[PDB]
Coordinates of C-alpha atoms in Angstrom, one line a residue:
Chain N
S1 CA -9.7 14.0 0.5
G2 CA -10.0 10.9 -1.7
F3 CA -9.8 7.4 -0.8
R4 CA -6.8 4.4 -1.2
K5 CA -5.7 0.6 -0.1
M6 CA -3.7 2.7 2.7
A7 CA -1.3 0.2 4.4
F8 CA 0.5 0.8 8.1
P9 CA 4.0 2.4 7.9
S10 CA 6.6 -0.3 8.0
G11 CA 9.2 0.9 10.2
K12 CA 8.3 -1.1 13.1
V13 CA 8.2 -3.9 11.2
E14 CA 11.7 -4.2 8.7
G15 CA 14.0 -4.2 11.6
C16 CA 13.7 -7.1 13.2
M17 CA 13.3 -9.5 10.3
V18 CA 16.6 -11.3 9.6
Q19 CA 16.7 -14.7 6.9
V20 CA 17.6 -18.3 8.2
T21 CA 19.0 -20.9 6.4
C22 CA 18.7 -24.9 6.4
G23 CA 20.5 -27.4 4.7
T24 CA 20.0 -25.9 1.3
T25 CA 16.7 -24.3 2.5
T26 CA 16.7 -20.5 2.8
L27 CA 13.7 -18.1 4.0
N28 CA 12.5 -15.8 6.4
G29 CA 12.7 -15.4 10.2
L30 CA 11.2 -12.6 12.9
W31 CA 13.5 -11.5 15.9
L32 CA 12.1 -10.4 18.7
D33 CA 14.0 -11.1 22.6
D34 CA 16.4 -13.3 22.1
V35 CA 14.5 -15.2 19.4
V36 CA 13.4 -16.0 16.0
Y37 CA 10.6 -17.7 14.5
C38 CA 10.2 -18.8 11.3
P39 CA 8.6 -21.6 9.3
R40 CA 9.3 -25.3 10.7
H41 CA 9.0 -26.9 6.9
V42 CA 13.3 -25.0 6.9
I43 CA 13.5 -28.1 7.9
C44 CA 12.2 -29.8 4.8
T45 CA 14.2 -30.3 1.1
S46 CA 12.1 -30.7 -2.1
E47 CA 12.2 -34.1 -1.7
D48 CA 11.1 -34.3 2.1
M49 CA 7.7 -31.9 0.8
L50 CA 5.7 -34.7 -0.3
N51 CA 5.3 -36.5 3.0
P52 CA 7.2 -35.0 5.7
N53 CA 8.2 -36.0 9.6
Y54 CA 8.8 -33.2 11.6
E55 CA 9.8 -35.5 14.7
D56 CA 12.3 -38.1 12.9
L57 CA 13.6 -34.6 10.4
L58 CA 13.7 -32.0 13.3
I59 CA 16.0 -34.9 15.6
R60 CA 18.5 -35.6 13.0
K61 CA 19.2 -31.4 13.5
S62 CA 21.0 -29.6 16.8
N63 CA 21.8 -25.5 16.4
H64 CA 25.1 -25.4 14.8
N65 CA 22.6 -26.1 11.6
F66 CA 20.9 -23.1 11.6
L67 CA 22.1 -20.0 9.3
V68 CA 21.1 -17.2 10.9
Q69 CA 22.0 -13.6 9.5
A70 CA 21.0 -10.4 10.0
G71 CA 22.5 -8.5 7.7
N72 CA 26.0 -9.3 8.3
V73 CA 25.5 -9.8 12.1
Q74 CA 25.3 -13.0 12.6
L75 CA 23.1 -14.9 15.1
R76 CA 24.4 -18.0 16.6
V77 CA 21.9 -20.8 17.6
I78 CA 22.0 -22.1 21.3
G79 CA 18.6 -23.7 21.7
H80 CA 15.5 -24.7 18.7
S81 CA 12.0 -25.6 20.3
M82 CA 9.0 -27.0 17.6
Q83 CA 5.5 -25.3 18.8
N84 CA 3.5 -26.6 15.7
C85 CA 3.9 -24.8 12.5
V86 CA 6.9 -22.5 13.3
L87 CA 9.8 -23.2 15.0
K88 CA 11.3 -21.3 17.7
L89 CA 15.2 -21.0 17.3
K90 CA 17.5 -18.9 21.2
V91 CA 19.7 -17.1 19.7
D92 CA 23.3 -15.4 21.8
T93 CA 22.6 -11.7 21.4
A94 CA 19.3 -10.1 22.1
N95 CA 17.2 -7.5 19.3
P96 CA 17.6 -4.0 20.4
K97 CA 15.1 -2.6 17.7
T98 CA 12.5 -5.3 19.5
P99 CA 9.4 -2.8 19.3
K100 CA 6.6 -3.3 21.8
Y101 CA 4.5 -5.8 20.5
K102 CA 2.4 -8.8 20.5
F103 CA 0.9 -12.1 18.8
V104 CA -2.7 -11.7 18.4
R105 CA -5.1 -14.5 16.2
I106 CA -7.9 -12.8 14.2
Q107 CA -11.2 -13.0 12.8
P108 CA -12.4 -13.6 9.1
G109 CA -12.5 -10.8 7.6
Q110 CA -10.3 -8.1 9.9
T111 CA -7.2 -5.8 7.6
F112 CA -3.9 -6.5 8.2
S113 CA -0.5 -4.5 5.6
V114 CA 1.8 -7.6 5.1
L115 CA 5.6 -6.6 4.9
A116 CA 7.1 -9.0 1.2
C117 CA 10.1 -10.4 2.4
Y118 CA 12.9 -12.9 0.6
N119 CA 16.7 -13.3 2.5
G120 CA 15.5 -10.9 5.3
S121 CA 15.4 -7.6 3.8
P122 CA 12.8 -5.9 3.0
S123 CA 11.0 -5.3 -0.8
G124 CA 7.3 -4.1 -0.6
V125 CA 4.2 -3.7 1.4
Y126 CA -0.2 -3.6 0.7
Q127 CA -3.0 -3.9 2.9
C128 CA -4.8 -7.7 2.3
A129 CA -8.3 -9.6 4.4
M130 CA -8.4 -12.5 5.9
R131 CA -10.9 -13.5 3.4
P132 CA -13.9 -15.6 4.8
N133 CA -12.3 -19.5 4.1
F134 CA -9.1 -17.8 6.0
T135 CA -6.8 -17.5 2.4
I136 CA -5.1 -14.4 1.9
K137 CA -5.1 -13.5 -1.6
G138 CA -1.5 -11.5 -1.5
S139 CA 1.2 -10.7 -3.7
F140 CA 4.4 -14.2 -2.2
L141 CA 7.6 -15.3 -5.2
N142 CA 9.5 -18.3 -4.4
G143 CA 11.4 -16.9 -1.3
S144 CA 8.8 -15.5 0.5
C145 CA 7.6 -17.9 3.5
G146 CA 8.2 -16.3 6.6
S147 CA 6.8 -12.8 5.5
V148 CA 5.2 -11.8 8.9
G149 CA 1.4 -9.6 9.3
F150 CA 0.8 -6.6 11.0
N151 CA -1.6 -3.6 12.8
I152 CA -0.3 -0.9 14.9
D153 CA -2.0 0.7 17.4
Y154 CA 0.0 4.2 19.1
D155 CA 3.5 2.4 19.4
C156 CA 2.2 -1.2 20.3
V157 CA 2.6 -3.6 17.1
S158 CA 0.0 -6.5 16.6
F159 CA 1.5 -9.4 14.9
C160 CA -1.2 -11.2 13.6
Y161 CA 0.5 -13.8 10.2
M162 CA 3.3 -15.6 9.2
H163 CA 3.2 -16.4 5.4
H164 CA 3.9 -20.6 4.7
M165 CA 2.2 -21.6 1.6
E166 CA 0.8 -21.1 -2.5
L167 CA -2.3 -22.9 -3.0
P168 CA -2.1 -24.8 -6.4
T169 CA -5.0 -22.5 -7.1
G170 CA -2.1 -19.6 -6.6
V171 CA -4.2 -18.3 -3.6
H172 CA -1.6 -17.5 0.6
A173 CA -2.1 -19.6 3.6
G174 CA -0.3 -19.4 7.2
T175 CA 0.1 -19.3 10.8
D176 CA -0.7 -17.2 13.7
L177 CA 2.8 -16.4 15.3
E178 CA 2.1 -19.7 18.7
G179 CA 1.9 -22.3 14.9
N180 CA -1.4 -22.5 14.8
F181 CA -2.5 -22.6 10.9
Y182 CA -5.6 -20.4 9.9
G183 CA -7.9 -22.8 8.3
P184 CA -7.5 -26.4 7.5
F185 CA -4.0 -26.4 5.9
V186 CA -1.8 -28.7 7.2
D187 CA 2.4 -27.6 5.8
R188 CA 2.4 -29.9 3.3
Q189 CA 2.9 -30.6 -1.1
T190 CA -0.5 -32.0 -1.2
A191 CA -4.0 -30.8 -3.3
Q192 CA -5.6 -29.0 0.6
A193 CA -8.7 -27.7 -1.2
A194 CA -10.1 -24.1 0.1
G195 CA -13.6 -23.7 0.9
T196 CA -16.2 -22.0 -1.3
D197 CA -15.7 -18.2 -0.4
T198 CA -17.6 -15.0 0.4
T199 CA -17.9 -10.6 -0.1
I200 CA -18.2 -10.1 3.6
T201 CA -20.7 -7.5 3.7
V202 CA -19.8 -5.3 7.0
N203 CA -17.1 -4.0 5.6
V204 CA -18.2 -3.7 2.1
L205 CA -21.2 -1.2 4.1
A206 CA -18.3 0.5 5.6
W207 CA -16.8 1.1 1.9
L208 CA -20.3 3.0 0.8
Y209 CA -20.3 5.4 4.0
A210 CA -16.8 5.6 2.9
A211 CA -18.1 6.9 -0.4
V212 CA -20.9 9.3 1.1
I213 CA -17.9 11.0 3.2
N214 CA -16.3 11.7 0.0
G215 CA -19.0 12.5 -2.6
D216 CA -20.3 10.2 -3.5
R217 CA -23.7 10.6 -3.4
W218 CA -25.9 8.5 -6.4
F219 CA -26.9 5.0 -4.9
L220 CA -28.1 6.4 -2.0
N221 CA -32.3 5.5 -3.1
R222 CA -36.1 6.4 -1.9
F223 CA -36.6 3.2 -0.6
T224 CA -35.7 0.9 2.8
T225 CA -35.8 -2.2 4.3
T226 CA -35.3 -4.8 7.5
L227 CA -32.8 -7.4 8.7
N228 CA -34.2 -10.3 7.9
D229 CA -35.3 -9.4 4.4
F230 CA -31.9 -8.1 3.6
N231 CA -30.1 -11.0 4.1
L232 CA -32.4 -13.1 1.8
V233 CA -31.2 -11.4 -1.1
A234 CA -27.3 -11.7 0.4
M235 CA -28.2 -15.2 0.6
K236 CA -28.1 -16.2 -3.2
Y237 CA -25.6 -13.2 -4.5
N238 CA -23.0 -15.1 -1.9
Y239 CA -22.5 -12.3 0.4
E240 CA -22.3 -12.5 4.4
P241 CA -24.8 -12.9 7.0
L242 CA -25.6 -9.6 8.2
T243 CA -26.1 -9.1 12.1
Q244 CA -26.6 -6.9 15.6
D245 CA -23.2 -6.8 16.2
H246 CA -22.7 -5.5 12.8
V247 CA -25.4 -2.8 13.3
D248 CA -23.2 -2.0 16.5
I249 CA -20.2 -1.3 14.8
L250 CA -20.9 0.4 11.6
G251 CA -22.8 2.5 14.7
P252 CA -20.4 5.9 14.3
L253 CA -20.7 6.4 10.5
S254 CA -24.0 6.5 10.7
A255 CA -23.9 9.1 13.0
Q256 CA -21.2 10.8 11.1
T257 CA -23.7 10.8 7.2
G258 CA -26.6 11.0 9.6
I259 CA -28.2 7.4 7.6
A260 CA -29.0 4.5 9.5
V261 CA -27.4 0.9 8.7
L262 CA -31.1 -0.2 6.9
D263 CA -31.3 2.6 4.7
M264 CA -27.9 1.8 3.4
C265 CA -28.1 -1.8 3.3
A266 CA -31.9 -1.0 0.9
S267 CA -29.0 0.8 -1.4
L268 CA -26.7 -2.4 -1.1
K269 CA -29.9 -4.7 -1.9
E270 CA -30.8 -2.3 -4.5
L271 CA -27.1 -2.4 -5.9
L272 CA -26.8 -6.7 -6.3
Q273 CA -30.5 -7.0 -7.9
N274 CA -29.2 -4.5 -11.0
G275 CA -25.6 -4.2 -10.7
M276 CA -23.3 -1.2 -11.2
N277 CA -23.8 -0.4 -15.4
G278 CA -20.9 1.5 -16.2
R279 CA -20.5 3.2 -12.9
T280 CA -17.6 3.4 -10.3
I281 CA -18.0 4.4 -6.6
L282 CA -14.6 5.5 -5.4
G283 CA -12.8 4.9 -9.0
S284 CA -13.5 1.5 -8.7
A285 CA -16.8 -0.8 -11.1
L286 CA -17.3 -3.3 -8.2
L287 CA -18.4 -4.3 -4.8
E288 CA -15.0 -3.5 -2.4
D289 CA -14.8 -5.2 0.5
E290 CA -11.5 -5.2 2.1
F291 CA -12.1 -2.1 4.5
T292 CA -13.0 -2.9 7.7
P293 CA -15.5 0.2 9.5
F294 CA -12.2 0.7 11.9
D295 CA -10.1 1.3 8.7
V296 CA -12.7 3.9 6.9
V297 CA -12.8 6.1 10.0
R298 CA -9.1 6.3 10.8
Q299 CA -8.6 7.0 6.7
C300 CA -11.2 9.6 7.0
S301 CA -10.3 11.2 10.7
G302 CA -6.2 10.6 10.8
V303 CA -4.3 8.8 13.4
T304 CA -0.7 9.6 14.7
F305 CA 1.3 6.3 15.2
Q306 CA 4.9 6.2 17.0
Chain Y
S1 CA 2.2 -15.4 -7.1
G2 CA -0.6 -13.0 -7.2
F3 CA -0.6 -9.6 -8.3
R4 CA -1.2 -6.0 -5.6
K5 CA -0.9 -2.7 -5.2
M6 CA 2.4 -2.7 -3.3
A7 CA 4.3 0.4 -1.9
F8 CA 7.9 0.6 -1.0
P9 CA 9.3 -0.3 2.5
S10 CA 8.5 3.2 5.0
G11 CA 11.3 2.6 7.5
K12 CA 14.2 4.6 5.9
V13 CA 11.4 7.9 5.3
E14 CA 9.9 7.2 8.7
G15 CA 12.8 8.5 10.7
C16 CA 13.2 11.8 8.4
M17 CA 9.5 13.3 9.7
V18 CA 9.7 16.2 11.9
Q19 CA 6.9 18.6 13.0
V20 CA 7.3 22.1 11.9
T21 CA 5.3 25.0 13.3
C22 CA 5.4 28.9 13.3
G23 CA 2.3 31.0 14.8
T24 CA -0.5 28.9 15.2
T25 CA 0.1 27.3 11.6
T26 CA 1.3 23.8 11.8
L27 CA 2.2 21.2 9.6
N28 CA 5.1 18.8 8.3
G29 CA 9.1 18.9 7.7
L30 CA 11.8 16.4 6.1
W31 CA 15.8 16.9 8.3
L32 CA 18.1 15.9 6.4
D33 CA 22.2 16.7 7.8
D34 CA 21.5 20.6 9.5
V35 CA 18.6 21.0 7.7
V36 CA 13.9 20.8 7.6
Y37 CA 12.5 21.6 4.4
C38 CA 8.7 22.0 5.0
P39 CA 6.2 23.9 2.7
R40 CA 6.6 27.4 3.1
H41 CA 2.6 28.0 3.4
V42 CA 3.8 27.7 7.3
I43 CA 4.2 31.2 7.6
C44 CA 0.5 32.2 6.4
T45 CA -3.2 32.7 8.7
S46 CA -5.7 31.5 7.0
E47 CA -6.5 35.0 5.6
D48 CA -3.2 35.5 3.9
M49 CA -4.0 32.2 2.1
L50 CA -6.1 34.8 -0.2
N51 CA -3.2 36.8 -1.2
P52 CA -0.1 36.1 0.1
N53 CA 3.3 38.5 -0.3
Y54 CA 5.8 35.6 0.7
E55 CA 8.2 38.6 1.1
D56 CA 6.5 41.3 3.0
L57 CA 5.1 38.0 5.5
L58 CA 8.5 35.9 5.2
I59 CA 10.2 39.2 6.7
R60 CA 8.8 40.0 10.1
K61 CA 9.7 36.1 10.4
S62 CA 13.5 35.3 12.2
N63 CA 14.5 31.9 13.2
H64 CA 13.7 32.0 16.7
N65 CA 9.3 31.8 15.9
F66 CA 9.9 29.0 14.0
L67 CA 9.3 25.6 16.8
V68 CA 10.3 21.9 15.1
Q69 CA 9.9 19.4 17.0
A70 CA 11.6 15.7 15.8
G71 CA 9.4 13.7 18.9
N72 CA 10.4 15.3 21.8
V73 CA 13.4 16.3 21.5
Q74 CA 13.5 20.1 20.3
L75 CA 15.5 21.4 17.4
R76 CA 16.6 25.1 17.6
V77 CA 17.2 26.6 14.2
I78 CA 20.0 29.6 14.0
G79 CA 19.1 30.5 10.0
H80 CA 16.0 30.8 7.5
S81 CA 16.5 30.4 3.8
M82 CA 13.9 30.9 1.2
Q83 CA 14.3 28.5 -1.9
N84 CA 11.1 28.4 -4.0
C85 CA 7.9 28.0 -2.4
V86 CA 9.6 25.5 0.1
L87 CA 11.5 26.8 3.1
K88 CA 15.1 25.5 4.4
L89 CA 15.0 25.8 7.8
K90 CA 19.4 25.3 9.6
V91 CA 19.4 23.6 13.1
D92 CA 22.0 23.5 15.9
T93 CA 22.0 19.3 15.4
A94 CA 22.2 16.7 12.9
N95 CA 19.7 13.5 11.9
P96 CA 21.6 10.8 12.9
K97 CA 19.1 9.2 10.8
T98 CA 20.1 10.3 6.9
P99 CA 19.9 7.9 5.1
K100 CA 21.3 8.2 1.5
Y101 CA 19.3 10.2 -0.5
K102 CA 18.8 12.3 -3.4
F103 CA 16.1 14.8 -4.3
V104 CA 15.1 14.2 -8.5
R105 CA 12.4 15.7 -10.3
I106 CA 10.1 13.0 -11.9
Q107 CA 7.3 13.0 -15.0
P108 CA 4.1 12.7 -15.6
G109 CA 3.1 8.9 -15.7
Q110 CA 6.1 7.6 -13.5
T111 CA 5.2 5.7 -9.7
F112 CA 6.4 6.9 -5.9
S113 CA 5.0 5.6 -2.3
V114 CA 3.5 8.2 0.0
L115 CA 4.0 8.6 3.8
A116 CA 0.6 10.3 4.8
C117 CA 1.9 11.8 8.3
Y118 CA 0.1 14.8 10.7
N119 CA 2.5 16.4 12.9
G120 CA 5.5 14.7 12.4
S121 CA 4.0 11.3 13.2
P122 CA 3.6 8.7 9.9
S123 CA 0.3 7.1 10.0
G124 CA -0.2 5.1 6.4
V125 CA 1.5 4.8 3.2
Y126 CA 0.0 3.6 -0.5
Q127 CA 1.2 3.8 -3.6
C128 CA 0.4 6.4 -6.8
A129 CA 0.7 7.4 -10.5
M130 CA 1.3 11.9 -10.7
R131 CA -0.8 11.7 -14.2
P132 CA -1.0 13.8 -17.5
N133 CA -2.2 16.6 -16.2
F134 CA 0.6 17.5 -12.9
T135 CA -1.9 15.9 -10.2
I136 CA -1.8 13.5 -7.9
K137 CA -5.6 11.3 -6.8
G138 CA -4.3 11.0 -3.2
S139 CA -5.4 10.6 0.1
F140 CA -4.7 13.9 2.5
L141 CA -6.4 15.6 5.8
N142 CA -6.0 19.1 7.1
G143 CA -2.5 18.8 8.3
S144 CA -1.0 16.4 5.5
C145 CA 1.0 19.2 3.9
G146 CA 4.7 17.9 4.0
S147 CA 4.3 14.0 4.1
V148 CA 6.6 14.0 1.0
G149 CA 7.2 11.0 -2.0
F150 CA 9.4 8.5 -3.0
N151 CA 11.2 5.4 -4.4
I152 CA 13.9 3.6 -3.2
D153 CA 16.7 1.7 -4.6
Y154 CA 18.9 -1.0 -2.7
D155 CA 19.7 1.5 -0.3
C156 CA 18.9 5.0 -1.4
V157 CA 16.3 7.0 -1.2
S158 CA 14.7 9.4 -3.8
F159 CA 12.7 12.1 -2.6
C160 CA 10.5 12.9 -5.7
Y161 CA 7.7 14.6 -3.6
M162 CA 6.4 17.0 -1.4
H163 CA 2.3 17.3 -0.5
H164 CA 1.5 21.6 -0.8
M165 CA -2.0 22.0 -1.5
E166 CA -5.9 20.2 -2.0
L167 CA -7.7 21.8 -5.6
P168 CA -11.3 22.3 -4.9
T169 CA -12.1 19.2 -7.4
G170 CA -10.5 17.2 -4.8
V171 CA -6.9 16.6 -6.0
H172 CA -3.7 17.4 -5.1
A173 CA -1.0 19.6 -5.9
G174 CA 2.7 19.9 -5.0
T175 CA 6.5 20.9 -5.5
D176 CA 9.9 18.3 -5.9
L177 CA 12.5 18.9 -3.3
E178 CA 13.8 22.2 -4.9
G179 CA 10.3 23.8 -4.6
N180 CA 9.4 23.5 -8.0
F181 CA 6.0 22.9 -8.1
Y182 CA 4.6 20.9 -10.7
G183 CA 2.5 21.6 -13.1
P184 CA 1.0 24.8 -13.5
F185 CA -0.2 25.6 -9.7
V186 CA 0.4 28.4 -7.7
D187 CA 0.9 28.1 -3.4
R188 CA -2.3 30.0 -3.1
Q189 CA -6.4 30.0 -2.5
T190 CA -7.8 30.0 -5.6
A191 CA -9.8 28.3 -8.5
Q192 CA -6.6 26.9 -10.1
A193 CA -8.0 24.7 -13.1
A194 CA -6.0 21.9 -13.8
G195 CA -5.8 20.6 -17.5
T196 CA -8.0 17.1 -19.3
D197 CA -6.0 13.9 -17.6
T198 CA -5.2 11.4 -19.6
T199 CA -4.9 7.5 -19.4
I200 CA -1.4 6.7 -19.1
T201 CA -0.9 4.0 -22.3
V202 CA 2.4 2.7 -21.4
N203 CA 1.3 1.6 -17.8
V204 CA -1.7 -0.6 -19.4
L205 CA 0.2 -2.4 -20.9
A206 CA 3.0 -3.5 -18.8
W207 CA -0.7 -4.1 -17.0
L208 CA -2.1 -6.8 -19.4
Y209 CA 2.3 -8.1 -19.2
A210 CA 1.2 -8.7 -15.4
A211 CA -2.4 -10.6 -16.5
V212 CA -0.7 -13.0 -18.6
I213 CA 2.9 -13.6 -16.2
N214 CA -0.3 -14.7 -13.6
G215 CA -2.7 -16.7 -15.5
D216 CA -5.4 -14.1 -17.3
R217 CA -4.8 -15.0 -21.7
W218 CA -8.8 -14.5 -22.1
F219 CA -8.5 -11.3 -23.7
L220 CA -5.7 -12.3 -26.0
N221 CA -6.6 -11.5 -29.7
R222 CA -5.9 -13.5 -33.2
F223 CA -6.4 -10.3 -34.8
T224 CA -3.0 -7.6 -35.0
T225 CA -1.8 -3.6 -35.6
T226 CA 0.8 -1.1 -36.6
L227 CA 1.3 1.8 -34.2
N228 CA 0.3 4.8 -35.8
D229 CA -3.0 3.1 -36.4
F230 CA -3.7 1.9 -32.4
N231 CA -3.2 5.5 -32.1
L232 CA -5.5 6.7 -34.1
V233 CA -8.6 4.5 -32.0
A234 CA -6.8 5.5 -28.5
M235 CA -7.3 9.4 -29.8
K236 CA -11.1 8.5 -29.4
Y237 CA -10.6 7.2 -25.6
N238 CA -8.0 9.4 -23.7
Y239 CA -5.0 7.4 -24.4
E240 CA -1.6 9.5 -24.3
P241 CA -0.1 8.5 -27.7
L242 CA 2.3 5.1 -27.7
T243 CA 5.8 6.0 -29.5
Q244 CA 9.2 3.9 -29.8
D245 CA 10.9 4.8 -26.8
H246 CA 7.8 3.4 -24.6
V247 CA 8.2 -0.1 -27.0
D248 CA 11.7 -0.5 -26.1
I249 CA 10.9 -0.3 -22.5
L250 CA 8.3 -2.6 -22.9
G251 CA 11.3 -5.1 -24.8
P252 CA 11.4 -6.7 -22.0
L253 CA 7.8 -8.1 -21.0
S254 CA 7.9 -8.7 -24.3
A255 CA 11.3 -11.2 -24.5
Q256 CA 9.8 -13.1 -21.0
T257 CA 6.3 -13.2 -22.2
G258 CA 7.0 -14.2 -25.9
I259 CA 4.5 -11.6 -27.5
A260 CA 5.4 -8.3 -29.1
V261 CA 4.3 -5.1 -28.8
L262 CA 2.1 -4.4 -31.4
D263 CA 0.7 -7.7 -30.2
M264 CA -0.5 -6.4 -27.7
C265 CA -1.7 -3.5 -28.3
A266 CA -3.8 -5.6 -30.8
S267 CA -6.2 -7.1 -27.5
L268 CA -6.1 -3.4 -26.4
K269 CA -7.1 -1.8 -28.8
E270 CA -9.9 -4.5 -29.1
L271 CA -11.1 -4.0 -25.9
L272 CA -11.3 -0.1 -26.0
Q273 CA -14.1 -0.2 -28.9
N274 CA -15.9 -3.2 -27.3
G275 CA -15.1 -2.9 -23.6
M276 CA -14.9 -5.8 -20.9
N277 CA -18.4 -7.0 -20.6
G278 CA -19.1 -8.3 -17.3
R279 CA -15.4 -9.4 -17.3
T280 CA -12.4 -9.1 -15.2
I281 CA -8.4 -8.7 -15.9
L282 CA -6.9 -9.2 -11.9
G283 CA -9.7 -8.8 -9.7
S284 CA -10.4 -5.4 -11.7
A285 CA -13.3 -4.4 -14.7
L286 CA -11.4 -1.3 -15.6
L287 CA -7.6 -0.8 -17.6
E288 CA -5.6 -0.6 -14.1
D289 CA -2.4 2.3 -15.5
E290 CA -0.4 3.3 -12.4
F291 CA 2.0 0.3 -12.6
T292 CA 5.5 1.7 -14.9
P293 CA 6.9 -1.9 -16.5
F294 CA 9.3 -0.5 -13.8
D295 CA 7.3 -2.1 -11.1
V296 CA 6.2 -5.2 -12.7
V297 CA 9.7 -6.4 -13.7
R298 CA 10.5 -6.1 -9.3
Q299 CA 6.8 -7.5 -8.7
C300 CA 7.4 -10.2 -11.0
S301 CA 10.8 -10.8 -9.8
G302 CA 11.7 -10.5 -6.7
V303 CA 14.0 -7.5 -5.4
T304 CA 15.7 -6.7 -2.4
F305 CA 16.3 -3.7 -0.1
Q306 CA 18.6 -1.8 2.4

């Protein structure tokens, strides 16, 4: 028992990481079959990032001006296609290490593991959540553009994220692996307004189920409520609106614990209004929102991979 | 920027995990060169775990009663040596996937990554700290005995932990890879008293340096103090005694921030006594103690591996 922010094993992802260079500018790429995906800002200089024209810049550029080290193995580029904000570099060799994969585009509120890389060399792995405003609150230093986010399904790697930029607010934005940004962001150096952030209510209710399962009872109440009523309280506390599709998804945990979603909302409602007052829930003194119900299910009931 | 509980890439460790079976009882092993290390409680039944005699039990047992799947590859055992609380099973094949490794024995207060496995299949990876009382507060379900903890040094994997048991208190105990338990614990089913736990002061002071680096200033104070004086306050709050060897180790962060250890203790001292009062430090409302100074240095200044 116990309960921790667990991340997926990174084995299958570490051997798709390579190093991309072009002019001075160097960052990370992802190698899968004969192709290297990377952020197209790679073609840009410090001066270019202010008001860059990708076409006019991309056109002074042909294959033999793109380095692609893969440790010490040297890939050679024969072709180069811009696809939205990613760049697809085609290469002579194909990755022996290519997992059974797929690109996907996730929704605000879902969780993935992030593999932070510098010079195509992996340095660490953490779990984080796409916030409602389409930013992530991660850990990225200068050089980390091209690091990726992923979920694992027994054998299959879903790629859901590629890191493109830090904002002036010190949060992170980026694209899917088709190159379409998450949120209203562009790959350009200017003040980009984010959006009001919100607490992910479906994930917080999952977090409280994890707590009961693990012996954390004290916050369970003798009261109760309805949906439309609870949302009202969730309005003035900047929680997201809970719906029917979230009562459905949370059903299995209701079945295990034997506590109906709405008897659980009644506990939370009380928590928003009266706070925690010197009290912890799984050694945390605020309401954790980065565990989907799917995450809690697979950590409280063990799961094979690979 | 930003700051997260980061864990080491697990690639190098996932391909040493195998599945060990013996009677009914099945758990995880670690395969390195020609040897499989595992917990010796593998030879025990549910009834045996109450008052087990390892000798008399080990002696009814020879090689051909030890299964060792490595996915679907079948290892055959030719020999079997008990070494303290681990068991060393020798096998016909040698691991092509064996990293440049070494066993070590760490100290209370140091951090490692844990790779939780079921049936020799990796399921997730988290960062945690050996507590002063030699327990870890991890995430382990039935079947997770034999999962390991590790640090990575560019190319080299240090193995520092093998999971042996959960206590009635729902915390975890286990051994080094030579088979000597951490703490006063035995591999037997009885009430085992742990010990008073303590906050790791050197790691908390590191955590506050990480915060200043990242824009978290508010808690920096106009006051100050000496060592012997601070410890006094740290007594009545169940913090560990800070020493000279901890001012030494913390020196580099003092050099970066330009805040002398003792000007930092003066901030903490105040925090213990007056609390946080509705206030967060890197989105946390209590004093985090699971980041060594070494961890903060390598997350706030990026590090290549492999």
